[PDB]
Amino acid sequence: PQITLWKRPLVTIRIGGQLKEALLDTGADDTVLEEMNLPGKWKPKMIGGIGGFIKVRQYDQIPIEICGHKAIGTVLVGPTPVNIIGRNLLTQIGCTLNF
Amino acid sequence: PQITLWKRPLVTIRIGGQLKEALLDTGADDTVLEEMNLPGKWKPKMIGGIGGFIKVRQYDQIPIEICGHKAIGTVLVGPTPVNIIGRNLLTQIGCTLNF
Numbered sequence A, B: 001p002q003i004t005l006w007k008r009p010l011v012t013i014r015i016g017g018q019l020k021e022a023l024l025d026t027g028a029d030d031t032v033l034e035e036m037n038l039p040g041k042w043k044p045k046m047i048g049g050i051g052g053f054i055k056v057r058q059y060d061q062i063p064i065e066i067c068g069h070k071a072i073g074t075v076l077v078g079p080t081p082v083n084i085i086g087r088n089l090l091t092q093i094g095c096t097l098n099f
């Protein structure tokens, strides 16, 4: 579909047994999700934006369904105020910017 | 244009006769530029990002040409990690997300 930007580009995503609302975010290199206890190996990382940094856990090869489109890749999990679908997964679902 | 997302969507903007590089950021409500001088009245404001809150100077009705498309709107100046074009101006230049 086409998503205008009059409002936040929030869409429904699924990660296992959790449905969440997440921003389609061209400003984010990688996907960052709100705190959740995912299975598997991870590694610590610090990511920065307006206000400074937060600490996150990097999980790899996590499948996420984004508006019914399948994706699989890196997911950073930590105390973000909003779920953020970053470019690493936006490319996988065929997302472009157009004007 | 159509802009894919395998690389950061960085574009050249013209503001006050200066060329700068800025990131098209659909996860940003607001346009935020790194410290610079702009003429006219401004208002102190605060905004929050992934890492907390910062103080910015709010300038209204600033022209920016974004990849050759004209916008006139609110520009916040302050300690963002990188110049970002947010939805307030993305809407003005007709930017949508498509997948």
Ligand SMILES: CCC(CC)CN(C[C@@H](O)[C@H](Cc1ccccc1)NC(=O)O[C@H]1CO[C@H]2OCC[C@H]21)S(=O)(=O)c1ccc(CO)cc1
Pocket: A025, A027, A028, A029, A030, A031, A032, A047, A048, A049, A050, A081, A082, A084, A086, B025, B026, B027, B028, B029, B030, B031, B032, B047, B048, B049, B050, B051, B080, B081, B082, B084, B086
């Ligand atoms: C470095 C470029 C961006 C910061 C400038 C990166 N951010 C994505 C950005 O879209 C966030 C996404 C975002 C959205 C809401 C809350 C926190 C973070 N938006 C944001 O800070 O927008 C601010 C300007 O407009 C306001 O309206 C929304 C908050 C204000 S980020 O969230 O900090 C971020 C995301 C992922 C990574 C890992 O690659 C690193 C940083």
